[PDB]
Amino acid sequence: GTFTWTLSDGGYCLTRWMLIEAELKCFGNTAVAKCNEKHDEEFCDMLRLFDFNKQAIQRLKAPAQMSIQLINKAVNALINDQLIMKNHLRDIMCIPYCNYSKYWYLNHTTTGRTSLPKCWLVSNGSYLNETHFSDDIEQQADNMITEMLQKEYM
Amino acid sequence: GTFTWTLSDSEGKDTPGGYCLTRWMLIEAELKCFGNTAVAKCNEKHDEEFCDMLRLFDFNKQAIQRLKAPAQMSIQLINKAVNALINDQLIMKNHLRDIMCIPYCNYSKYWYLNHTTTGRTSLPKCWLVSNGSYLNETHFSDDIEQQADNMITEMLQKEYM
Amino acid sequence: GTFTWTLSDSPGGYCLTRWMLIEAELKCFGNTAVAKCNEKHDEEFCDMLRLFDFNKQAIQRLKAPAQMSIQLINKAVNALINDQLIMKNHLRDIMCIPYCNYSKYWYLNHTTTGRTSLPKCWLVSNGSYLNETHFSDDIEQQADNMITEMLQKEYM
Amino acid sequence: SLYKGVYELQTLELNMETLNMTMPLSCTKNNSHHYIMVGNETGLELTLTNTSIINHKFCNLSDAHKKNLYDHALMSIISTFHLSIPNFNQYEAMSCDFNGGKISVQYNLSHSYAGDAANHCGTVANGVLQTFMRMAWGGSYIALDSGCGNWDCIMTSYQYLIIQNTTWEDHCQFSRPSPIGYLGLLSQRTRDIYISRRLL
Amino acid sequence: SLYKGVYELQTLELNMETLNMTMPLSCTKNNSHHYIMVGNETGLELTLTNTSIINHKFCNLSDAHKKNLYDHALMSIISTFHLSIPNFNQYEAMSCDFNGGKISVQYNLSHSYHCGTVANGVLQTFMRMAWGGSYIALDSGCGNWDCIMTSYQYLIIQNTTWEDHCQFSRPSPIGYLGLLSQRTRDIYISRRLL
Amino acid sequence: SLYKGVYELQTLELNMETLNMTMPLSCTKNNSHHYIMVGNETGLELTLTNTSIINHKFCNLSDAHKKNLYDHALMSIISTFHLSIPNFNQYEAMSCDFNGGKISVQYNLSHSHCGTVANGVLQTFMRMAWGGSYIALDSGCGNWDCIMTSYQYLIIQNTTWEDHCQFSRPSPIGYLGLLSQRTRDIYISRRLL
């Protein structure tokens, strides 16, 4: 059916081991909460796989023999497999797509507030230039401003 | 993929967007009617055990009224209809919580808040179990309190309009 | 599970061309109606928009095969539609209650703004279509929904 | 039809033929002949009849596969249909002939001991017909003894469901073409099958 | 108690017994016995024992199918149960007897003895089919997945008549409905044409 | 890069290596070699070559299952790959050897060109080793149904852990992406099944 896993830990943090050449990064509840409603965010699906792995290791006995049976059952509660299919279709059709590696987000200069990361797209073996999707970056900047203003008006 | 069945019209006196659990649907209890502001959430969220059960009960009720019965019972209908009624990954979430020693919903018991002067209720949440029995009120008092504030927030927004 | 396909953008909204309709030339829908297809899992109209948009993109972007292939559509089905709406209308048909057969839709159009609601499926019963007097409740609900939206637009 | 003097009720009818290049479309011609079209060249004819065309119990599906002379688009459709039959067990009920790459599949929907109580809610027909009903859903109900109100004990007067390859032609006289029947079956196939061997 | 001075905490217990007309319901009787009921007439008995009922290595399914006789609702439940066992490969571990339309399926858990073995796979499915209170069945009961095991030697599934055996836990449709989704997810390839 | 005078654009790159203990991770070394790693000990090597290794027509899966000497995590991966091939009707195309618990699987891609075996096998490959899988194809994109490569064989064998990622980073996506479509495009091979 649809995802159900709830991240266990407000906000959510990615530790140093989960990031390439980076230290601990934390996102607040406004951005994290979006992972409980949207079905098209690659970042949120990865966020659930990392959280799942963390809990599975801490809570279940590890067998001497390696096994992937837990993920074969848990996977549909964790990720949207049709998001994977969407990026696959974009790839075969020569449309820029997410390979779930690099993500970008906007970070407010005086408050440290961040957006939910969006996937940096790739095409023809490389990352797209910022210019090429600067329109989506600009739209997200306005979306962040809009949410901040609404909170001030509430 | 995603459930599509909507609840049938429950009663001719109760708000049409709400839903009633009749006496035959409850253990040792009389008729309980939930308002539309509770029930409407069953058309939006994919993480409510109570709503999945309402759809199974409503489905059963309609199937036995609208379809011809066979001489022997068949389960072919539910094997096809279930996907339209419940989130099977909600079942999996509760399965995983059990194996990992995390309190979980076994779908038998639910709790809700009921306003003492208006009769307004929340959508019921599942009462969780752990170590062979039910969790204490204290143990999930944080969720009870959160729902109480969510109900207050919704009523204030309605009054504001 | 859930759908993910994003419809190709119109500057906002979506429009059907003449070859997509039965003798009705062209019809364009506003962005505020089309946008609802990204939130709802229960709209037969939105699922058809995705199958048509997919068909168009597959034709324009992929090299034609020597012979027709079904592999592409099978891979894309869940990305494009909610298969449980086929199951829903199937259940409604077998239980003898009005249901959507996906060919005909209706919507309300405000005569002074030109804005329309998202189309709803015209239902059928005893092998034929129901009457505006049979599903009058849904017609009126759509009118109320549009009124609320027009008032919000004036407010904003 | 101007509601409240403000909202005109307008309609839209979709031309699903423009989808023929990427997905199969099915329609009903009349009570006995229903079709699934692929692109603008071929498709399947699904006929409910009282006359058999296959009069043996061989299929040799594995030979067809090795030879690879069949149109893959059509074999895919046959596979989806067959695996969508709930609780299939009476293997003798189906026979086939794939000679030359042609596709021909015949279900025998005949029920033995018909006058034994209702004795009509577990036979193959009760399945094969349910699967059919979905494959040609836009108009298939017209071919049943009872179009609706009966899910489990569905019967028809026809004795055989014969599925054969057919060239493309415009046969959509009763209903419009639609991709929906086929698409719906794709999430149902294999969901409710019986185990025939300890290792599947 | 009373929350915020205005809300009373109230509960529901759902009588899932009324769902018997449309879907199988399962419950637990005690540590060794579990049940799956169909309507108000029949169902399956799931027994954890130290004894055999079948003392051979055959499971003629292609004679059960040719002859019908068996109750289709119950064969569908058996097929769901078996297909959901992950990585089943030890075909000798299961024997059955469908003579006359009766249902009898026996799984040998001693056959495969620690973690990641066949017996554990059989139990992982068991633990879900009778999920509502299945914890009673294990030597441990939590904190383990591929190391789930019982001291019992056999899991035996047989057809019975309807009887109210829901003494340890209440009946619920959830076990069966849950297993319908991961029906073929962990099946190994055995035949290339598959 | 400052947007609206308010937000700085920042990046994040995920280290999917920490997911090794729960799920298989695949990556690209070069055009001929791609890998699937399991845990921190083993995995599969997926090689596109012009050299055959099995050189016979047998694939003794039933024997392998009875003996049970294979690593179950890897047999599971092989089964997911095989059942994901959209129109596999040529039993002769896949030969295997599971002797001693070893895994050796060989697909013959030589009959290529539309709707062929190589097409179906390569499409599955494209997803299993998705991070960089396209570099091994004659046409990177714009062609779904008539996919070709110059390599005659796809050989999958059990290997050991080592850092085999040069072209792309490890990712769980290929495997997980295949699981939901694992049995969706299969021909009927039996009347009763």
Ligand SMILES: *[C@@H]1O[C@H](CO)[C@@H](O[C@@H]2O[C@H](CO)[C@@H](O[C@@H]3O[C@H](CO[C@H]4O[C@H](CO)[C@@H](O)[C@H](O)[C@@H]4O)[C@@H](O)[C@H](O[C@H]4O[C@H](CO)[C@@H](O)[C@H](O)[C@@H]4O[C@H]4O[C@H](CO)[C@@H](O)[C@H](O)[C@@H]4O)[C@@H]3O)[C@H](O)[C@H]2NC(C)=O)[C@H](O)[C@H]1NC(C)=O
């Ligand atoms: C959802 O549910 C609706 C509700 O029922 C359903 O709508 C119905 O669809 C059918 C099929 O499209 C419509 O049937 C058409 O009816 C007209 C008129 O019929 C009268 O006149 C004929 C004259 O021969 C009489 O026989 C008949 O009894 C009536 O008195 C027919 O003219 C249509 O036939 C033509 O189109 C067919 C399809 O293309 C051709 O196969 C057929 O040969 C006819 O073609 C003519 O035009 C061609 C050029 O365009 C020319 O080349 C030919 O030589 C020929 O001249 C057809 O039978 C029915 O009216 C709809 N009912 C309603 C209430 O709207 C939807 O189909 C269903 N949707 C889905 C997906 O299931």
Ligand SMILES: *[C@@H]1O[C@H](CO)[C@@H](O[C@@H]2O[C@H](CO)[C@@H](O[C@@H]3O[C@H](CO[C@H]4O[C@H](CO)[C@@H](O)[C@H](O)[C@@H]4O)[C@@H](O)[C@H](O[C@H]4O[C@H](CO)[C@@H](O)[C@H](O)[C@@H]4O[C@H]4O[C@H](CO)[C@@H](O)[C@H](O)[C@@H]4O)[C@@H]3O)[C@H](O)[C@H]2NC(C)=O)[C@H](O)[C@H]1NC(C)=O
């Ligand atoms: C979700 O998780 C929870 C927690 O794990 C689980 O809750 C438990 O459910 C079971 C099943 O209903 C409850 O068990 C019942 O308990 C009563 C009371 O037992 C106590 O009091 C008696 C008093 O004499 C003592 O003897 C006893 O030792 C205990 O102290 C029992 O009376 C129930 O048994 C009767 O009903 C059974 C059928 O359900 C009969 O088979 C049985 O023989 C008994 O029948 C007798 O009485 C009937 C009248 O009621 C009469 O008609 C009969 O003819 C006959 O005379 C039963 O054992 C258990 O208490 C619950 N635990 C908690 C903490 O609440 C949920 O079930 C689980 N849900 C799901 C779906 O998984």
Ligand SMILES: *[C@@H]1O[C@H](CO)[C@@H](O[C@@H]2O[C@H](CO)[C@@H](O[C@@H]3O[C@H](CO[C@H]4O[C@H](CO)[C@@H](O)[C@H](O)[C@@H]4O)[C@@H](O)[C@H](O[C@H]4O[C@H](CO)[C@@H](O)[C@H](O)[C@@H]4O[C@H]4O[C@H](CO)[C@@H](O)[C@H](O)[C@@H]4O)[C@@H]3O)[C@H](O)[C@H]2NC(C)=O)[C@H](O)[C@H]1NC(C)=O
């Ligand atoms: C999503 O899509 C993107 C875009 O395609 C893709 O990004 C690319 O990922 C690869 C894989 O990580 C990156 O490749 C690395 O590049 C560095 C730098 O390369 C330059 O310098 C070397 C110096 O020798 C030159 O040869 C080269 O031509 C370049 O000029 C390399 O250093 C990396 O190789 C080392 O690390 C590998 C393991 O990480 C080893 O296997 C390899 O042998 C090398 O190891 C040696 O150095 C190590 C240093 O720490 C040392 O520890 C070892 O012991 C040993 O001595 C590697 O080739 C590539 O740059 C990315 N491209 C871009 C545009 O960013 C994503 O991966 C893809 N993601 C997913 C999930 O699909």
Ligand SMILES: *[C@@H]1O[C@H](CO)[C@@H](O[C@@H]2O[C@H](CO)[C@@H](O[C@@H]3O[C@H](CO)[C@@H](O)[C@H](O)[C@@H]3O)[C@H](O)[C@H]2NC(C)=O)[C@H](O)[C@H]1NC(C)=O
């Ligand atoms: C679907 O059915 C049609 C028939 O209704 C099949 O068409 C034709 O079938 C014959 C069978 O022997 C093919 O063989 C021979 O072809 C030569 C070609 O020159 C012809 O001279 C012979 O008289 C004889 O017909 C014939 O090629 C084939 N037609 C075409 C255009 O290929 C059709 O093949 C069936 N579909 C599939 C997928 O096979």
Ligand SMILES: *[C@@H]1O[C@H](CO)[C@@H](O[C@@H]2O[C@H](CO)[C@@H](O[C@@H]3O[C@H](CO)[C@@H](O)[C@H](O)[C@@H]3O)[C@H](O)[C@H]2NC(C)=O)[C@H](O)[C@H]1NC(C)=O
């Ligand atoms: C299996 O489920 C069915 C319901 O789905 C259970 O039967 C139902 O039981 C209730 C209470 O006994 C019946 O309600 C009342 O019946 C009397 C009959 O004279 C009527 O006058 C009242 O107005 C009211 O309707 C209900 O009708 C009945 N359902 C049916 C179809 O008859 C059944 O008991 C459950 N079986 C088991 C073993 O638990």
Ligand SMILES: *[C@@H]1O[C@H](CO)[C@@H](O[C@@H]2O[C@H](CO)[C@@H](O[C@@H]3O[C@H](CO)[C@@H](O)[C@H](O)[C@@H]3O)[C@H](O)[C@H]2NC(C)=O)[C@H](O)[C@H]1NC(C)=O
């Ligand atoms: C369930 O599975 C277990 C294990 O596969 C079966 O038990 C095994 O039975 C064999 C004999 O059939 C035992 O081996 C031999 O036993 C004789 C006894 O006199 C001895 O003289 C030989 O030297 C040899 O040891 C084997 O040890 C035993 N294994 C275990 C773990 O108990 C059991 O029979 C199966 N039961 C059913 C109903 O299928």
Ligand SMILES: *[C@@H]1O[C@H](CO)[C@@H](O[C@@H]2O[C@H](CO)[C@@H](O[C@@H]3O[C@H](CO)[C@@H](O)[C@H](O)[C@@H]3O)[C@H](O)[C@H]2NC(C)=O)[C@H](O)[C@H]1NC(C)=O
């Ligand atoms: C496979 O992935 C696991 C992660 O799931 C990698 O193991 C992890 O390695 C880090 C660094 O060695 C361990 O961090 C430790 O934190 C404690 C905090 O008190 C500190 O005292 C230790 O000195 C150390 O820094 C982390 O615990 C460990 N995780 C697990 C589950 O053991 C592993 O290296 C990866 N293997 C391969 C081949 O990539």
Ligand SMILES: *[C@@H]1O[C@H](CO[C@@H]2O[C@@H](C)[C@@H](O)[C@@H](O)[C@@H]2O)[C@@H](O[C@@H]2O[C@H](CO)[C@@H](O)[C@H](O)[C@H]2NC(C)=O)[C@H](O)[C@H]1NC(C)=O
């Ligand atoms: C079911 O049998 C187990 C195992 O007992 C042994 O193996 C049997 C196949 C048979 O050959 C027995 O005679 C053997 O003793 C029982 O579990 C063991 O019980 C003993 C105490 O009697 C204890 O020391 C062991 O550690 C237990 N082993 C395990 C795995 O827990 C089990 O109690 C028997 N079940 C019943 C209901 O009697």
Ligand SMILES: *[C@@H]1O[C@H](CO)[C@@H](O[C@@H]2O[C@H](CO)[C@@H](O)[C@H](O)[C@H]2NC(C)=O)[C@H](O)[C@H]1NC(C)=O
């Ligand atoms: C399926 O294969 C069987 C082989 O046993 C075919 O049956 C016989 O085949 C021999 C040799 O080809 C013939 O001389 C006999 O006359 C055939 N007997 C009958 C009754 O047909 C069978 O024809 C094949 N069926 C299909 C559909 O290919």
Ligand SMILES: *[C@@H]1O[C@H](CO)[C@@H](O[C@@H]2O[C@H](CO)[C@@H](O)[C@H](O)[C@H]2NC(C)=O)[C@H](O)[C@H]1NC(C)=O
């Ligand atoms: C399943 O069917 C096979 C084949 O009929 C049975 O094996 C035969 O059993 C009979 C009766 O004991 C013997 O006379 C035959 O010699 C056996 N061999 C065969 C293959 O014919 C088998 O016994 C059946 N299942 C059971 C109950 O064990």
Ligand SMILES: *[C@@H]1O[C@H](CO)[C@@H](O[C@@H]2O[C@H](CO)[C@@H](O)[C@H](O)[C@H]2NC(C)=O)[C@H](O)[C@H]1NC(C)=O
């Ligand atoms: C399991 O099912 C079988 C088959 O329905 C039941 O046994 C039948 O009982 C009737 C009683 O009149 C006899 O006429 C049949 O000949 C029996 N058939 C068989 C195969 O034994 C059996 O009783 C059921 N199990 C239980 C515990 O009731």
Ligand SMILES: *[C@@H]1O[C@H](CO)[C@@H](O[C@@H]2O[C@H](CO)[C@@H](O)[C@H](O)[C@H]2NC(C)=O)[C@H](O)[C@H]1NC(C)=O
């Ligand atoms: C892969 O398949 C090709 C074709 O099926 C095999 O090549 C054939 O080998 C025979 C000799 O055994 C020659 O007579 C044919 O002319 C060859 N055909 C082609 C197209 O090359 C090849 O041997 C197979 N590879 C393996 C390892 O079995």
Ligand SMILES: *[C@@H]1O[C@H](CO)[C@@H](O[C@@H]2O[C@H](CO)[C@@H](O)[C@H](O)[C@H]2NC(C)=O)[C@H](O)[C@H]1NC(C)=O
């Ligand atoms: C594998 O061997 C085949 C030959 O059996 C190579 O195929 C062709 O070889 C000729 C040699 O003159 C070239 O001109 C063609 O361009 C090759 N065709 C293709 C599609 O490449 C094939 O190149 C060899 N593959 C590899 C990876 O070395």
Ligand SMILES: *[C@@H]1O[C@H](CO)[C@@H](O[C@@H]2O[C@H](CO)[C@@H](O)[C@H](O)[C@H]2NC(C)=O)[C@H](O)[C@H]1NC(C)=O
């Ligand atoms: C692939 O798996 C096989 C089987 O486990 C590995 O070969 C075994 O290696 C051990 C020593 O570690 C020997 O004792 C066994 O006799 C070997 N068995 C066989 C069948 O060869 C093999 O090494 C693994 N592949 C790689 C690259 O490590």
Ligand SMILES: *[C@@H]1O[C@H](CO)[C@@H](O)[C@H](O[C@@H]2O[C@@H](C)[C@@H](O)[C@@H](O)[C@@H]2O)[C@H]1NC(C)=O
């Ligand atoms: C198909 O042939 C059989 C003989 O084998 C007939 O009995 C079928 O007709 C049946 O009886 C008639 C009187 C009518 O009630 C019909 O509905 C029954 O199915 C015959 N079926 C057809 C369509 O001709």
Ligand SMILES: *[C@@H]1O[C@H](CO)[C@@H](O)[C@H](O)[C@H]1NC(C)=O
């Ligand atoms: C409950 O907790 C106690 C702690 O000592 C433990 O012994 C007992 O087995 C637990 N019960 C269940 C059902 O897990």
